[PDB]
Amino acid sequence: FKHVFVCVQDRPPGHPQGSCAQRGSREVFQAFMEKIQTDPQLFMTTVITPTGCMNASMMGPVVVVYPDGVWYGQVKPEDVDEIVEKHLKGGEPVERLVISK
Amino acid sequence: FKHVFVCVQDRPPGHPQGSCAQRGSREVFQAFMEKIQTDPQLFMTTVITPTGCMNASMMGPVVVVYPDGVWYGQVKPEDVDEIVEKHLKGGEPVERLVISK
Ligand code: FES
Ligand code: FES
Structure with missing residues (x-):
């Protein structure tokens, strides 16, 4: 079992650190969701969860x-x-x- | 290091499974945030992250x-x-x- 968390937070335009949504993360989240089901092997061992800010926004999209404890940044x-x-x-x-890690 | 995920999903009233937010989970989230930010031994080692549905809604609030991979339900x-x-x-x-677990 793996649990994938995708930050989908958006922020108003003046927020210094920006946001993962501004950096394409809802399309990241969508892409994970499109895979995890059209793939039987993924579907029965993987959960994809959208989240608010995980406090690494300038390195986003954060996944x-x-x-495992693997933090990804800049995910497209x-x-x-x-x-x-x-x-x-x-x-x-x-x-x-x-x-x- | 510990990473706590609190489902804060809301749902419209006809949704059969209801939601964690209707079951009090926003107050659960807020309580975790207050605790971690005011505890000198957790504030540097603990992250509290709000999420969308983690697919256990009838057991909500889900944390x-x-x-560790410990799932909690019915958290007040x-x-x-x-x-x-x-x-x-x-x-x-x-x-x-x-x-x-
Ligand atoms: S907005 Fe995504 S980590 Fe902060
Ligand atoms: S609404 Fe919280 S687990 Fe589904």
């Missing part, structure tokens, strides 16, 4: 995978397939996007 | 603690202190409220 919708394949199915975090 | 605001003391600090999940 966290538990129980185009990166969701690699995270699904390599990490959620393969067990190997996508090193280039990691901001914390 | 999940990672990386009045139970937050016990979870903070016994689990977040003490390392012993509040057995009575656990719905999954």
